Amino acid sequence: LQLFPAPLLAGVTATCVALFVVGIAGNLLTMLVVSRFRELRTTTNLYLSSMAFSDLLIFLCMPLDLVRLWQYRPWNFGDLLCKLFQFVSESCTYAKVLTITALSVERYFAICFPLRATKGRVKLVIFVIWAVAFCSAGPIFVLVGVEHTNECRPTEFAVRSGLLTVMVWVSSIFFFLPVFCLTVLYSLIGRKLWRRGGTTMADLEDNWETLNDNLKVIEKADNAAQVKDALTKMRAAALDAQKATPPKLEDKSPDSPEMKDFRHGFDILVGQIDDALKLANEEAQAAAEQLKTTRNAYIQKYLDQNHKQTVKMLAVVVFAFILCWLPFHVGRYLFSKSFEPGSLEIAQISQYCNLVSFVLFYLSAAINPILYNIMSKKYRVAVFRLLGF
Amino acid sequence: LQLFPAPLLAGVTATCVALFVVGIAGNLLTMLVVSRFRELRTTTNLYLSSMAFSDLLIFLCMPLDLVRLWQYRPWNFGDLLCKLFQFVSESCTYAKVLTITALSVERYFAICFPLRATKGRVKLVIFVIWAVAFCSAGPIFVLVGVEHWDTNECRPTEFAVRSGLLTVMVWVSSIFFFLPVFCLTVLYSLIGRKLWRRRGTTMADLEDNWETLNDNLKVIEKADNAAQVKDALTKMRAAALDAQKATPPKLEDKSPDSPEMKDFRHGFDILVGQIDDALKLANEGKVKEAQAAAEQLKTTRNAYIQKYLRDQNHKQTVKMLAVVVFAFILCWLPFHVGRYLFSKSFEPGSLEIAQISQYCNLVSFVLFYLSAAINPILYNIMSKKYRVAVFRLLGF
Ligand SMILES: Cc1cc(-c2ccc3c(c2)CC[C@H]3N2CC3(CCN(C(=O)Cc4cn5cc(C)sc5n4)CC3)C2)ncn1
Ligand SMILES: Cc1cc(-c2ccc3c(c2)CC[C@H]3N2CC3(CCN(C(=O)Cc4cn5cc(C)sc5n4)CC3)C2)ncn1
Ligand SMILES: CCCCCCCC/C=C/CCCCCCCC(=O)OC[C@H](O)CO
Ligand SMILES: CCCCCCCC/C=C/CCCCCCCC(=O)OC[C@H](O)CO
Ligand SMILES: CCCCCCCC/C=C\CCCCCCCC(=O)OC[C@H](O)CO
């Protein structure tokens, strides 16, 4: 009994085809980047790659969604399709949710408890996630169907035995998990990142990242008569970088490495900067190269440094996930509260809500690589360098 | 090695997955539609269904083809995978050309030699087509391989190049390419020239009128209204006059004052009269009586006119086939032109050559899968009966 004009459906379908193409392309790019370069295979990235895979699966779901969208009369075998593919879609959703959770959890202990002490661990957790998600979505196979509107919805057997309400429990738990991750875990992350002794943990990262970028840019690019300003920035950043407290110290050491690390790093920065300043007024590039090796010889010795961009990008990611998934849940609750009353206009509202949930579903499947491209510079360079050497 | 951005290659890959979905769906639908709708089981439709098969077969190759495009060696039998699947692809391509040619030929004979002349025949012709294709693509199997700068495929081996077999296969490929060109250029242009040859109207016009008569006859089978049945009948009557003037194909080599044109031209005189009487029943609120009259129209039409004319849809058919064959040639053109230009070009191994060649191969790749997926689209755009049958099976 659908009330969507042909122009509206055509626009939805074209948008969805667009999302199909862009999302396949981008999630493929993400998975390839992770599998290609060794340094990018951090725990967080492996989880993201898992999610990229779930997104690809969702895109394979899309064609039958579009078919069902345009059908006036569903197929005889359609019931099975419904069951199977609803299961598929929701399995993926659950898996992605859990991956986010795992991810967030395993970043959380990575910052708030730096002191806590593996390969195959990540594979095991991914496998655990997929099995748990399959089991949690299992019931869908036996609770939704197509009965004598006329759509892939929960059957009456599901309604009149309570099983619908336990599946809504499961769905709501799964919805609140990423909300918990963004609101509670990411906020505790951000606390520890922006907590005071001379400066904060995030300011360490920015300063350290500012000093290296200036030196590395000039060492291999942007040749000019005077790069002393970059040398000045390096000195200032190195100066502030001493005021911070690296993670291995645990900020419980007033002077035992506070004297060791401050003296050693500041000394290497100091003397090299003074010699670089003299050559800058008048071999300067070689002095910068020599300064670099001491940094690697000391920075690697007592230090991830991407803790801030990682958390901020994960925040945007989890936010977009929850946004796209919110209208479904909200509409479901508000329309469950009024079932029989006013079944005329509320039906129109419900179909439009389901349509926006549809488009949002596939948008969520496509959006993460776009975010990565806009926010991660490392991601950009890795897609640039993907087919090289 | 790869001389274009990864985002381009990922986007091409996704586009190809889209063509995979659409092409599997469309060609499946073509085969189903022909197999179930019996008033769509023509000779040429059976040939098109054969083609739909070859296209499905092509789309199964696309997963491994994309793996090879990304230069992933997941296995060590790549060499074998190449000899096999390249063979597969060429065979399928050859099959289409031959089946195109086959149906073109038949359709040509049907129209230009109308005075001249079963379901086992088409089955045998398709069998023979597939045999000739498999043999003709056979040598691909033994002279392509994967063995030891700026290139990256499965490609002709040195044994192929330096024994002359590669040139023989380029000849074979070029002949196959030109067969559909011959079909479109020669056969279809002669067909259209006879189809639109004046004698009051043209043969193509008579087919439009016949087709409007048969369609409006189907309307009265289910019409419920005076104006509904009367509308159909009004359109028929204009059609019947304007078709009475035509010169039937079985009687093309006759005189305008023949005993056969009398019976033809008088047969429409009756058929107009029957329409007039069914109209006068419709005017007076006799809907079920006008439909009974309209059935006499069928039997009158059946006796006089079917004997004076087999297929009554040549014009629409050949327009569609021209679009199909043109699309085929266009998609296969860059491969052939590029191969020739790069053989003639004085310089191999240059980077600009390498980049040009890689881009040409990429667009040819996409074109190959586009040619495999586009036919059901064209049928849906052009044939209405086919589009309706597809929508019925899809539930639209
Ligand atoms: C021809 C036919 C097809 C089907 C059929 C029925 C259902 C579904 C599918 C096919 C594919 C996948 C599944 N389709 C996923 C889908 C539509 C969009 N969906 C929403 O809108 C709700 C939602 C979940 N979710 C998760 C996020 C993260 S964001 C977000 N929104 C989710 C369910 C339904 N049956 C009978 N015959
Ligand atoms: C993992 C692996 C895979 C393979 C392998 C090698 C080759 C091919 C395939 C797999 C699949 C099919 C075959 N692939 C078809 C193909 C690519 C696209 N091709 C073109 O672009 C040229 C063309 C023909 N043609 C006909 C038209 C009509 S339009 C048009 N274009 C045709 C050849 C090659 N080997 C080694 N390890
Ligand atoms: C919002 C950003 C837009 C960027 C990219 C937007 C377009 C992407 C794909 C277009 C091809 C899809 C083909 C059209 C898909 C729906 C077709 C349809 O439903 O019927 C229309 C038909 O053409 C009536 O004759
Ligand atoms: C060695 C290098 C040689 C390279 C040579 C490349 C030439 C390709 C040019 C083709 C344009 C010719 C236009 C032909 C248009 C025919 C369209 C057609 O017949 O189909 C339409 C259909 O019939 C509608 O009713
Ligand atoms: C070439 C034919 C292949 C068909 C399978 C393609 C695979 C993708 C499936 C669905 C895309 C969305 C369906 C596009 C909607 C087209 C239907 C349409 O626009 O026709 C209106 C009709 O009256 C309905 O009410």
Residue numbers in the entry:
A (entry chain B): 35 to 151, 156 to 186, 195 to 242, 1001 to 1086, 1091 to 1111, 255 to 340
B (entry chain A): 35 to 151, 156 to 186, 193 to 243, 1002 to 1111, 254 to 340
Task: Give verbatim excerpts from the published study on this entry.
The ghrelin receptor exerts a wide range of physiological functions, including appetite regulation, alcohol consumption, adipocyte metabolism, and glucose homeostasis, due to its broad distribution and multiple signaling pathways through divergent G-protein coupling or β-arrestin recruitment. The ghrelin receptor is reported to have high constitutive activity. Here, we report a crystal structure of the ghrelin receptor bound to the inverse agonist PF-05190457 and a cryo-electron microscopy structure of the active ghrelin receptor-Go complex bound to the endogenous agonist ghrelin. Combining the structural comparisons and cellular function assays, we find that a polar network and a notable hydrophobic cluster are required for receptor activation and constitutive activity.
To describe the molecular mechanism of the ghrelin receptor in binding with PF-05190457, the initial construct of the ghrelin receptor was truncated by eliminating the first N-terminal 34 amino acid residues and the C-terminus after residue 342. To facilitate crystallization, a thermostabilized apocytochrome bRIL was fused to the third intracellular loop (ICL3). In the resolved crystal structure, the PF-05190457-bound ghrelin receptor is packed in a P21 monoclinic lattice with two complex molecules per asymmetric unit. Whereas PF-05190457 adopts an extended conformation, the arm-1 ((6-methylpyrimidin-4-yl)-2,3-dihydro-1 H-inden-1-yl moiety) of the ligand projects into the cleft between TM2 and TM3 and is covered by ECL1 and ECL2 regions, making van der Waals contacts and hydrophobic interactions with R1022.63, Q1203.29, and F1193.28 as well as disulfide-bound C1163.25 and C198ECL2. The diazaspiro core (2,7-diazaspiro nonan-7-yl moiety) of PF-05190457 is adopted in cavity I, forming direct interactions with D992.60 and S3087.38 by hydrogen bonding. Arm-2 (2-methylimidazo moiety) penetrates deeply into the helical core of the receptor, and it packs against the side chains of residues F2796.51, W2766.48, and F3127.42 in TM6 and TM7, opening another hydrophobic pocket defined as cavity IV. Notably, the side chain of W2766.48 rotates nearly 180° and tilts ~3 Å toward the extracellular end, and together with the side chain of F2796.51, it also displays upward movement, therefore pushing out the extracellular end of TM6 and enlarging the ligand-binding pocket, subsequently impeding the formation of a salt bridge by dragging R2836.55 away from E1243.33. Through structural comparison with ghrelin-bound, the PF-05190457-bound complex structure shows breaking of the salt bridge between R2836.55 and E1243.33, breaking of the weak polar interaction between R1022.63 and Q1203.29, and newly established polar interactions between the inverse agonist and residues S3087.38 and D992.60. In addition, the binding of the antagonist occupies the orthosteric site and maintains the conformation of the E-R motif and WFF cluster.
